[PDB]
From a paper:
We have determined the crystal structure of M. thermoautotrophicum ΔH [name] at a resolution of 2.2 Å. The strands β1, β2 and β4 are parallel, while strand β3 is antiparallel to the other strands. The overall structure of the [name] dimer resembles a body with two long, extending, flexible β-hairpin arms, agreeing well with the dimeric structures reported for typical members of the [name] family. Helix α2, and strands β3 and β4 are involved in dimerization, through hydrophobic interactions as well as hydrogen bonding. In addition, each monomer in the [name] structure contains four salt bridges: Glu31-Arg89, Lys35-Glu85, Arg37-Glu69, and Glu49-Arg52. Though [name] is an acidic protein, the concave surface of the molecule corresponding to the DNA-binding surface in Sso10b is dominated by positively-charged residues, but its positive electrostatic potential is much lower than that of Sso10b. The other three pairs of conserved positively-charged residues, namely Lys16, Arg44 and Arg83 in each Sso10b monomer, are substituted, respectively, in [name] by neutral residues Asn11, Ile39 and Thr77, suggesting that these three pairs of residues should be key to the interaction between typical [name] family proteins and DNA. [name] mutants N11K, I39R and T77R with the neutral residues changed to corresponding positively-charged residues acquired DNA-binding activity and the triple mutant N11KI39RT77R exhibited even higher DNA-binding activity.
However, unlike typical [name] family proteins, [name] is an acidic protein which contains 13 acidic amino acid residues and only 8 basic residues, and its potential isoelectric point is only 4.56. Although [name] has no ability to interact with nucleic acids in vitro, the overall structure of [name] still closely resembles other [name] family DNA-binding proteins.
Numbering used by the authors:
A (entry chain A), B (entry chain B): 5 to 90
The structure:
């Protein structure tokens, strides 16, 4: 389950998800922070639109998390969680 | 009561939202496509965390919109919808 979207190409994450669900896994949750947020929405839509029609988007949550940014100091980021179920 | 979120500074949008919701309008829909998706979630979080603690996130939808270029070029863009309510 749980697939963290980062700075790798969207397709890499799309392939991760798909492999997992073709392999039998029923649920994956996409997690992303900040700028990767739009890329997580991208992974969800591509997987549904091109690979696993059937896939249900169960529940989407957003929150705020705290991380230490590139400058060395604490900072708050938006985050998203997308529950995929086949 | 629908706000389109693009590439303007985040606070521009936050302003528009808060003003509206404090001055009556009890429901508002955030909408964005592509990378603005990130800005859109930020706006929501900044509102719910900094300005109107009470606010409720009614519903988040995602989908793919298709747009046509001047020349005929069809593009699939990811898109999001965030319903807020006080």
């Amino acid at each position: 389950n749980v697939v963290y979207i980062g700075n790798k190409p969207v397709m890499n994450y799309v392939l991760a998800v798909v492999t997992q669900m073709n392999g039998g896994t029923s649920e994956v949750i996409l997690k992303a922070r900040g700028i990767a947020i739009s890329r997580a929405v991208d992974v969800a839509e591509i997987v549904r639109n091109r690979f696993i029609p059937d896939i249900q988007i169960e529940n989407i949550d957003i929150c705020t998390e705290e991380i230490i940014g590139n400058e060395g100091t604490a900072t708050n980021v938006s985050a998203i969680e997308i529950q995929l179920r086949k």
